[PDB]
Amino acid sequence: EEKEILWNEAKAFIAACYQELGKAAEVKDRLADIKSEIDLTGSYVHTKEELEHGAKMAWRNSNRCIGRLFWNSLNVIDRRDVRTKEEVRDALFHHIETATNNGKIRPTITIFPPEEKGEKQVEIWNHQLIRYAGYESDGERIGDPASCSLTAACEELGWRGERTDFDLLPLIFRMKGDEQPVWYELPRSLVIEVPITHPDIEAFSDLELKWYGVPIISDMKLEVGGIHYNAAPFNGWYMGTEIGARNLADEKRYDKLKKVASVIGIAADYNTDLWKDQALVELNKAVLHSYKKQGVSIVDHHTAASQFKRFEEQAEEAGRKLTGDWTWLIPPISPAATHIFHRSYDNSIVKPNYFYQDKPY
Amino acid sequence: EEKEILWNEAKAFIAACYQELGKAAEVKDRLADIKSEIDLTGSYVHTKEELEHGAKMAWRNSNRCIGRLFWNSLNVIDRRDVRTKEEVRDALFHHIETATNNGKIRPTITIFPPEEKGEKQVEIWNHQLIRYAGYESDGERIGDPASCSLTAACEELGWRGERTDFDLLPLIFRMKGDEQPVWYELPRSLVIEVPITHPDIEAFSDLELKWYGVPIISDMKLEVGGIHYNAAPFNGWYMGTEIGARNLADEKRYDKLKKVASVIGIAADYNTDLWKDQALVELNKAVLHSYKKQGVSIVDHHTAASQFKRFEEQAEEAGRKLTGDWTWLIPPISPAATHIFHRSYDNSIVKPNYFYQDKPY
Numbered sequence A, B: 001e002e003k004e005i006l007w008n009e010a011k012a013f014i015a016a017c018y019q020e021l022g023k024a025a026e027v028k029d030r031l032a033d034i035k036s037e038i039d040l041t042g043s044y045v046h047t048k049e050e051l052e053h054g055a056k057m058a059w060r061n062s063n064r065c066i067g068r069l070f071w072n073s074l075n076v077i078d079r080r081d082v083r084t085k086e087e088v089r090d091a092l093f094h095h096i097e098t099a100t101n102n103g104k105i106r107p108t109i110t111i112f113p114p115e116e117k118g119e120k121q122v123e124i125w126n127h128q129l130i131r132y133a134g135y136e137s138d139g140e141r142i143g144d145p146a147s148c149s150l151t152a153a154c155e156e157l158g159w160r161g162e163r164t165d166f167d168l169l170p171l172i173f174r175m176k177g178d179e180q181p182v183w184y185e186l187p188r189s190l191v192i193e194v195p196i197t198h199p200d201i202e203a204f205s206d207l208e209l210k211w212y213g214v215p216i217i218s219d220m221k222l223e224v225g226g227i228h229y230n231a232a233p234f235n236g237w238y239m240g241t242e243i244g245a246r247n248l249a250d251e252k253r254y255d256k257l258k259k260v261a262s263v264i265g266i267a268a269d270y271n272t273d274l275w276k277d278q279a280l281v282e283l284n285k286a287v288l289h290s291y292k293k294q295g296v297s298i299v300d301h302h303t304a305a306s307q308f309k310r311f312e313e314q315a316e317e318a319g320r321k322l323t324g325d326w327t328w329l330i331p332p333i334s335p336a337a338t339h340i341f342h343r344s345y346d347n348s349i350v351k352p353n354y355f356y357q358d359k360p361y
């Protein structure tokens, strides 16, 4: 069964991939090489072209992603050659540096060796390569509550956070054959952070908010042609609302709206004053302003939705079915001001794609 | 088949209704009366208690409605006795007056005679009893574009709008046996309108915006126990975002955001300035303020979501499955600031319920 699943996924993928690459005539011979390879080895190895286009197709198929217009420009780094934890660490450091690109963020994916017998070669524990720690104890909450479980797991490995609201979690991953993950502190020179200030409201710096420049999702599985790349961290740039309407605003995250309300000089007393909405807008304006001011890539949700509309038009023009998850595609502020809100999307799962996998902690 | 559908829906409804009313023991005898009635007449007649609780259950089952906490307080007006167009007209006028209640809006439904052989006794053409006309011609757009088709249909019946942006459409409905609907101008004394002003920004009145006090949906079919009440207009009060984030803001409706931006003194030039979001918040604050100032019922989306959370808790506590359509339940501004956004809802259709039906024009 295992092998039959693999073979069927490989056939569909290679046929589709090669068609898109204009290599339609090579499908037959490649499929033959793959089938015998699967027969012999229980698996097969992607060519660099297949892997690269596979990661791009996976992004293009990511229903929840508004940023897919740029799918074909994904920078794919093939690190299927890594074998040691230092090679993994340096590959992760490299991804951060090359994706960050001095602020002009390059959408990048680094692809590590894939699972073999469902057995991981590299198991990344981080949810994002760059993320803040979270702590909860003695009534006290510090940092990002979303990171509490990983933070506690890290501190079981002998790491200790300074317990600021913005401690960078170390990289943490486990190699095949090791019982415990290893952790490495992020070099701060690698990590761009953006202080959050507001273009018009000077008191906004009193909140001492900041966020990191590059969201590098590191806990999803890239599946391409039946091959499971469980370790394949990827990044785009932020859409401002992710930071301003969610990371800094959610009650279960940094929960900053009341403080925002206070510094922008509005009462946070009456639902009918829409103070939360006003705070959200000002916080989101601040986030966009701050990233732009620092020369770090970011997109506002209106521009992002306009780009997504072009992705829709490109899909229709290429004869590709468009898939989408409306609930994730609409931005969390002024969604009805985007075209996304006013149409529907087929939430079908098409592969290649990125998938959730169980946390190792 | 027709009759079998009816009988099965009746059994389920009566059993459920009577259970909720503590009349469990009367189900058997009532079901017998109904079956013989269906046998004899091809249909059956709801008792006033069944009809009332039916309309309430239908509201309680309305997946898209955030206002359902108050389902059990629906004021049900039974107008199954009407036979003439003047009785229908006066019943509609009465609904407007009694629902409006001098601004302290009473959620009300007026139930007209149900379809018989699928044949309507009363066919209401209005989408809402109170709504503004829309016109498009010679490049020029006036009023509410959403009403363009009905407006044109009305003007085919000898009605003529003044072509302000806020012409009240007349009531328009067709009686069984008549080829053409009749129309009646709404008495202006019946119709509460609210001028839109802003609590802090005096220039906001320069927009000369207004909206009507009571949304009275008049084109949906109430289905209860297999009986199709195609004419059963109902109303709640507005949630502010419906007016401020949709009716006045949508590009395909009144499209007021650029004008709002101008009067609140912000540039409408750059997506990154989030001027649309800021305009939306200020427009929505104005709408809530204006309704409150005029003593007309309205709810803000935060309060509405808190009420909905209580509806969820009430459902769980009553042992009723909760159904919901997340895409309609989230408000179109700051949805992530509500609990609704952060959970999922079973969008199953449970009857009794309100359903779309084909437009007669």
Ligand code: HEM
Residues within 6 Å of the ligand: A055, A059, A062, A064, A065, A066, A067, A068, A070, A074, A107, A108, A109, A234, A235, A236, A237, A238, A239, A242, A299, A304, A327, A328, A329, A330, A354
């Ligand atoms: C180029 C800039 C990018 C932007 C602005 C962007 C935007 C977004 C946003 C805003 C979301 C979350 C939507 C929400 O919270 O409701 C998202 C989800 C996602 N994006 Fe993108 N994205 C970008 C690049 C990428 C890249 C390069 C990949 C992969 C190669 C990717 C794959 C995904 C996936 C898989 C999700 C869903 C994650 C999940 O289910 O938790 N995106 N994107």
Ligand code: HEM
Residues within 6 Å of the ligand: B055, B059, B062, B064, B065, B066, B067, B068, B070, B074, B107, B108, B109, B234, B235, B236, B237, B238, B239, B242, B299, B304, B327, B328, B329, B330, B354
């Ligand atoms: C009491 C005040 C009420 C409030 C604040 C309220 C709120 C809302 C809102 C905001 C929506 C639309 C959601 C959206 O646009 O995304 C809605 C939809 C709906 N409401 Fe309510 N509602 C109320 C009363 C009622 C009543 C009395 C009924 C019927 C007896 C009702 C039945 C519905 C139905 C059927 C829909 C869906 C309409 C459609 O599919 O087009 N609501 N409600």
Ligand SMILES: Cc1cc(N)nc(CCc2cc(CN)cc(CCc3ccc4cc[nH]c4n3)c2)c1
Residues within 6 Å of the ligand: A215, A216, A217, A234, A235, A236, A237, A238, A239, A242, A327, A328, B341, B342
């Ligand atoms: C590569 C990349 C770039 C970018 N700019 N953004 C992302 C998405 C990051 C992300 C990751 C996760 C973890 N599953 C969640 C979210 C938002 C999650 C979320 C949470 C709740 C809701 C409700 C409706 N939509 C919702 N979406 C966002 C990924």
Ligand SMILES: Cc1cc(N)nc(CCc2cc(CN)cc(CCc3ccc4cc[nH]c4n3)c2)c1
Residues within 6 Å of the ligand: A341, A342, B215, B216, B217, B234, B235, B236, B237, B238, B239, B242, B327, B328
């Ligand atoms: C009784 C009642 C009271 C009240 N306050 N609001 C309503 C709902 C009125 C309404 C009617 C219709 C017509 N189908 C539509 C809408 C909003 C429609 C809408 C349109 C687009 C989207 C996208 C996501 N959700 C969306 N919802 C709202 C009904």
Ligand SMILES: [Cl-]
Residues within 6 Å of the ligand: A215, A242, A247
């Ligand atoms: Cl994030």
Ligand SMILES: [Cl-]
Residues within 6 Å of the ligand: B215, B242, B247
């Ligand atoms: Cl409306």
